[model samples]
Target: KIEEGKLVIWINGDKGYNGLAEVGKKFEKDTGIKVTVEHPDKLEEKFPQVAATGDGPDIIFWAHDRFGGYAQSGLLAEITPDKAFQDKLYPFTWDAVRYNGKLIAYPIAVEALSLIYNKDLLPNPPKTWEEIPALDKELKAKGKSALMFNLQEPYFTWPLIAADGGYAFKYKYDIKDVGVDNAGAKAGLTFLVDLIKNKHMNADTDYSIAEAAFNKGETAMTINGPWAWSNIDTSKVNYGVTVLPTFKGQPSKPFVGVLSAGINAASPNKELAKEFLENYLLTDEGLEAVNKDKPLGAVALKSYEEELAKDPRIAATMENAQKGEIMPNIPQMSAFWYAVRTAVINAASGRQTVDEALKDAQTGSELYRQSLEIISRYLREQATGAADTAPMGASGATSRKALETLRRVGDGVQRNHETAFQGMLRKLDIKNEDDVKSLSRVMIHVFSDGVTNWGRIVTLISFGAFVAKHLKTINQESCIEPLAESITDVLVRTKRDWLVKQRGWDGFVEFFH
Candidate 1:
């Protein structure tokens, strides 16, 4: 039975609720106050309704992405972490909890898609995606395909699409640049289309189909998440997990999902709930207690990593998640997901040209993006003051420093190795001496992988200068000026905000140095 004046917490699922309930016993002894942990049905569905009426639990546990919607509705109480707490967890977990430049939640654990293969079927996993077709032929002899996954779902396919630079948004939480129709995305989609056309992949594949196929040992490999391990173990199939293999010499990265907790704004016990979270729930002992009952994959606490990694599946997932993109918490992500799903299916089924498929996706998503923008702005305005700060880092001083670094890096490359750079481009077979559009295509070819950081930016500019030098070497004489301009334009367009957040070139210099 529910008790009055007791601190309350709502966990989405009951798997680890028992562990927390035990921890609540300790809280009761310490504070002379009772604590209740609940596993409620339809937590997401019921929270908004209850919170709007000022009658929800003190705290709620859920995925980090949902915090954006909660924040938009003013249902979440902002949680600010001091340096000691921030240093206790993996760095990227901070990005997961951020919303509108403020931390809206506390991350507990992380998960991402990884390549899982039956070790007996694939004793040695291939290092490159180019090997999949040949592997498919070999596996087919034994009534198996090389890999099977949900073809229409972007969550599974994003690693493939983004391995060559396709993205829903350009930078983390920066929605101005949408890259769904970009050259790298087209190249990645073409890779998938070719796999389906060559019979190496199933065009009709979905989650259930892929899961059943893999569990039944009908496929040599499949992409799955850490949560699927129980079902896999139930099927008794011997499997090994690893990060997605490189495609065309570029790494494949999956989207990272973090499990998190947040205080409810409507709760009268905000301070008491915060005390419970800080002292009990977020502690290393607290996480370990929960893990005793239900395994938490890729815990955010740095000290717990070695202990969790003892389980090979958790190790692989942790490794992969380190290289994966943190799922953006922006509300606009809903539209991106909806549009990309249609684009992937149409292209795979041959219902539309890849170009048309993606182009239409961009256009189709624009209306929703605009609508979401207006609604989000209005909601944010109504909920909080317009005093929202830009995401952390990115000061004016570092911006100038970043500009200076770019100039030095670009100039040094063009001066010392112009001839060598031309030869390199020819070797990669990047031909097309057209305008900025054509040069932009070469940019895709160079930075085909999905990682967007200051190092990648520096590399793009260094190679871009070489491309300019090579363009001058060719008959496209007038294009030399536009080469630098295009490079700068691309940087500013795709990564300006990120550059600022990284403290311009200041952070880059430290990261590489």
Candidate 2:
């Protein structure tokens, strides 16, 4: 139990230590409690050690992402709020605290990306991506850049890609469903590449430079998160924030970083910790203390809306947050970050084609999947008390037999059968190797049905002379080539047409080569 005399806390120094100090004093004075706040010079080192030792402060104020590692390591506590507290929080806010279906923290603020545009220069932000190019042309004619997005920062590009129906990963606990290789992701990457190469929306400039350029009216707009607004000199520039523009009618959905409060697992007083969290941290007064100086978005609690609505930036950010997704705190998320960023950078730099970059990213995602499978297999072995063993002739024999069966079937189909096979292959257009394999399987099924139903029983008994006469031609490679060519021709034609219609010359180049 936390001793009645002392209540300890850890907070980020970079995020305003003095602001937290004033609040700590007020908390102590109001409750007649002794509040001991630790401002570690290197919290990156100290906090992890404290958590590891199971001797950390009762409360911690940090970004929610850190809790994923701590939770996985059993260094953080699970917190469940009462019904009253639950009723007051936003659904997304509650989502921030949840990891692997358990409430692990209390959300404090929501952070999201938005268009921070200069009102003096543009007066109004471009409502869509199409409008941005025209604005860029106007700015260039006037000898200025229209936008100052960070070409190096995927965080800036992610929202734009999301607006185009691209997602980084598929939602699955096993990590096998990573969608980095999918068509939607490729479309998003292609759009980003076109934006950087053709439109010049971003460059290699640092964020500080981008902020200064925007504030000084050197650039018209920038894609940035809420924390950046406070750092910019708003007095110098008539600036306003808004959502990133859409392609059709769909709004851009940025990744959200939520700040949250977490209790130490080894705290002596769990009830006192809960009391500090539910009563003080979530209260209107407490929320104002936490967010008033460092306004990001509305506090997780609805009661703080009046205070948040007063600030234009916070209002826009909260509106954007309604459409944003709370970033996953899954342990496998780290593996996904670098891979996604690498694909984005490669596409932006013109170092790799979008198709090639996406293909590599999909391959990279398999590492996470493979790791999960390894862990799962190990755990399963432990549960079953069995030694891991390779199944006999499971790999080589199965592959050879499958290939042989496919070849034999392709050779024996008639003209009518060939037409049916062509129709089926058209439906399964060859977008990738998987489509090719799928079509191969369908042909094999038709071949097996023909052999078993028509030839084996009826022809062997009633038409033995005819069966012997046709056996040589049925096995001949020349006889099967026509059916194979018909199916192949349909797949090739459909793939080429789809590519030309969707992406034009670029699609032709990627597929043909």
Candidate 3:
């Protein structure tokens, strides 16, 4: 099965695929080796399947990230780039395309996550992680959020993935060192999660929501990449780019990935493919062609620095990659991404017990049920002229927002428990809706065991009468009088003593917090 004088490069049919066509054409014309660029729809999964069978490309064009799978699997050709070529390229890129400690790819391009903010939203970019949060007030004042990003994607989630002292697995991948499960990684996630809960960010927003929200000035800043430039309407957004807010005591490390081309070990013409990729890729014309229509982050070579420097966004991304570590090309990083997702979902969803960090979540969900139960009681009392709770007072009015938040929290707990409790019950060989209905009863007993009820009771009574202002919105007209009656009765009973009232309101705020 020998073929001669021809080379093929498989690209994902995205970003680098079309732009590299001209470069492929030039290499073939100059070297007398025919060049073909193949578009494989499922190239990442397909690359090794076909390449392992000896039907892959002499060269493949793709991001340097997936190289670890091919390299470790023994499907990629690893060659030390000539030192002359090394000097022309960015050092970080060489590090990205390496696999099994060997240089396995020819670096062509680079991209990674970076901070893009509306220049007008800030007087100057935040110099540290702590400073970014300080901008929340002004951003909030104008009805714009200071920072926003998608929580569903691990790529966005792992931007802060690092190691100890709040440091992420900064640069290289160590075989046994799984960063996602470590303490440092937990701290990093906690930091981002705090932003969500504290009103600084919305945790449920996705990419489309983020881009549209940013473009419309709903938020002043977002974590995004250079590829997002085309989708952004710069006309509406006067934007600037910066390396991630290096606020953590350690560096904020996102994946500093390179877009690269590497030879397939199974190729028929490795020698020719090697020569063109290693030697010709840095030429001024070749560099210009690869970057033609695509707004590449930074080319691997220093040869085009002057031209690239003209674009601030590209420069900032390059600057971040230089300071950031190579995203691990190791296949283990695939698990790392998904592992991070589970950890975040576990934390945000408040379903199962994750760890000590989730202790408040356990307590919070109980209070959420308390919120619903007490509010329902008040609704019933008011419906029948049963004046059971306190009146509209200053101490109680502010707590209304807390009650609403708890309702949502309680609602989430009920949803997540119903969705996942089936697995645990199955281990016990239990089935049927009755068992499922009992599942909630079991969880409530488990969660509410030590939680104090009197604290929330007073809290709801103090701040709860405000629910009456929207009284007509209640589900049934017949139930309204009893709700007011219960509120009337409880407040009269609660306001009988100042210390009782103080403990009541103080405890409610503390519980929600």
Candidate 4:
């Protein structure tokens, strides 16, 4: 426990160092507690060393995913939910802190994912992943790249998985069902793999590369969090933004991470810590200090809607947050992180098929689970005076079934790129170079119009083609059927006409001649 007069804090030096330092000053002035904040770049390396010696900061601000790993190592303190705190926060934000029934952190701001494009280059952002391909193809033909993002980061891949109806883990008590093998996850993997493989996007690019590309006008689009807006130089380019296009018409949900302050479990000045957190950390006065220099859409006790309204970049991102989902902070979640990241990188780089990559990840994650089960079973055997030969924590059969389901999903997506391609061709009508070239321009206009689900429309067109080719033809002439048929016929005929134009009418006729 920390004494009231001696409260020390540690924060990350990479990004939020200055903001946290200002908060520390406010905390010292408002309360009588002495505060020190250190901005060390190597928190991961230094934190454990300090924590091992039973000495660390009373408060720390870092990525939320690290919470799971820290809490598991006995380095983090659980934040017991008080009615006042619970009542004030959004349920989604609160859920991000709770893992295995323990509340671990206080959320400050929820960061959301957005499709960012340079207005000078794209003049519009893609509303759907389906639109991304043709847009990229056109850009490449024009000697430009359409977009770039971190293909290796699981954080960036979550939206693609969610768009395809997958998640990293499923919560059931303290245990989680890692869904790295799920169909939705696979669908997302396939999409990403195709994006890189077909030259719609590029891998091996970090955030810096994406930023540099956007600035130099070499790239037109990228996926990023709200914090990226301030870093972008909008001086020469007119850029627009929008949400990711969804699979099956549902919006693409990004994994939202909340940045917050929490009291150290060992702190003796618990009351002072809580007071500082509530009064200074969450209040407008405290938030101003955090946001004044480096602005992230950190949610405070008071709404910053008015401030968000003034900035075009923030305004568009605010719309995405309304559609975002808070990422889970479950301790077991850490077990899947590296595995998922490896799988995504492998799939993106063509080193492994999505199924092969995800299956490897699923196997690794399940092995970890089984190892836990074996330990549990061995402990039980010892306690019950039974033979100690049995494994400790054998997983339930249901878990295997769930894991299998996940794998099937991932595999299906990897092998189903043809379907996705057909869907894109059907929806976007890219039979000729002209149609392909217009995609970039059309995507820009769609962003300018603020039209959501343009991606869905594209998907529907693509998927509809696949479905149409397989469905039995009907001769019935009901109004609805006829109307639908007419629309379908027009789409198909237009594609055929375009192909004929490209191939030459005589060449097209020669095939049937």
Best by lDDT: 1
Tens digits of lDDT, candidate 4, 390-506: 322234543333223323332343246666655654676533333433454444343335333323323323332333322212211122222233233222223322322323212
Off by over 4 Å in 4: 1-15, 30-49, 78-88, 99-102, 171-176, 233-237, 247-250, 267-272, 298-300, 305-324, 385-513
Clashes of each: 2, 5, 40, 26
Over the full model, what C-alpha lDDT does candidate 2 score relative to the true structure? 0.61
lDDT of 1 by residue, 372-474 (tens): 2322222232223241243323233433344445455545655676677667677655335444556665665556458786556655666655555455455
Candidate 2 residue lDDT tens string, 2-40 = 444567888765354455556667767777776777767
Q: List per-candidate RMSD values in Å.
A: 18.4, 17.5, 20.6, 23.0
Q: Model 1: number of clashes?
A: 2
Error of 1 at 192 (Å): 2.8
Candidate 1 TM-score, true structure as reference = 0.62
| Alpha-carbon runs more than 4 Å astray in model 3 | 1-16, 25-42, 55-58, 62-65, 80-87, 90-92, 128-143, 163-174, 198-204, 230-236, 248-250, 269-272, 306-311, 345-513
Q: What is the per-residue lDDT of model 3 for residues 381-433, given as tens digits with 9 covering 90 to 100?
A: 43344534653222234335444444544444434554343444345332332
lDDT of each: 0.71, 0.61, 0.60, 0.59
When sorted by TM-score, best at the front, the candidate numbers are: 4, 2, 1, 3
Error of 4 at 446 (Å): 62
Off by over 4 Å in 1: 1-60, 81-87, 172-174, 197-199, 269-276, 289-295, 309-315, 346-353, 364-513
